Amino acid sequence: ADTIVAVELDTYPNTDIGDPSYPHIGIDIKSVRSKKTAKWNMQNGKVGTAHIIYNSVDKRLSAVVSYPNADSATVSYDVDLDNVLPEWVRVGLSASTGLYKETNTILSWSFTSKLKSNSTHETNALHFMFNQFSKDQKDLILQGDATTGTDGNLELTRVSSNGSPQGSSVGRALFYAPVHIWESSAVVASFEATFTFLIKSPDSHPADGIAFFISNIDSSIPSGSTGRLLGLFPDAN
Template sequence: MKAPRLFQALKPPLPLPSQQLTLLQLLEFPSSLHDSTIPPHSGGRLLGLFPDSNALKNSSSSNNETAIDFKASSDKVVAVEFDTYHNWDSWDPYYKHIGIDVNSIRSKATAQRNWQNGKIATAHISYNSASKRLTVVAFYPATKAVTLSHDIELNKVLPEWVRVGISASTGAHKQKNTILSWSFTSSLKNNGVQKKEDMYIASVA
């Protein structure tokens, strides 16, 4: 199957055995599924990850806009979102935030975060298979870090092989997002022997 356009920059593809992951440490965003395709009508607030067919119109909107409720996606996706814009939908927090999404644009957990325009931020995303906990730590230099965690069994949510990538989107308003660098580190258990593999994926100036 042709590699999804979201991840064509990753050559060769980097499929990973999700059931063997003991620790993930990434900069600025993980995850999507192996041999996936970009869902139709998934731009804007759907981040290029979730199809518009997941949306159910709900007439009980308090702001005269169509409220949207999202079913779980048929694609298996675990994502960390860095949301800088409130979409005025019931599912979207009214504050700028970090969110952990599991098969849906409706976040399982969120943490408020103040964004500093033009400043360089660092984010660490880690998963510990022993505690079944996904943790995000984000900070600017000389500021207090924002931490968000969510308990999840990745081997029950994701397929055996997954891809790691980055997705971004805008709607009527635009902003510039620059990823200076990101890296991936994993510790895999193989026949009782722990082997550590470091992979440097991309650097963007």
């Protein structure tokens, strides 16, 4: 299987697989059963911001999700990324729909990674920033139903031409360049991601969510990973 570390914006409560009974943000370490979650007051049809930090100093993964003029939702987990991920990774955005559906629109995405040797005391770094997505976006690997260029946006899941989102949809976008995330247990990268998103549903119950993830460089959408598996995990274990 793939090795996945993720921050999930989970719209749909799957209580039979350990989700809390409400929309939530979570940190996922090699499992869709979040190691840590916080209640998320998702606003159907509003543009929100996601802010994620891995701080190598504390070995702490952090995520804040917020809407303008509302209080944020936050989650944090201590994890040795050197002991979980391979040395080289791709970073991406994933989304899914199931029986229930939502638009999974990404309007912007930025990422920074810094890896600094103890010996040199000098840093290697990668930064990209998309404020607009292009019809033929060659620095992104699109998987499943993911498309770009509609209103300059990244549509992670299938939307019809009238604007209606579709069920049983999955789609991912990975940055083309692989990212160097550790050299030893003592030298680990810090990174920062931001994205803005628009989750719109006609349904009383939107589903299933958006995730920022780090995987092995050759990661692909697992078979049957629509709905509650967020296009990340082969099963709900």
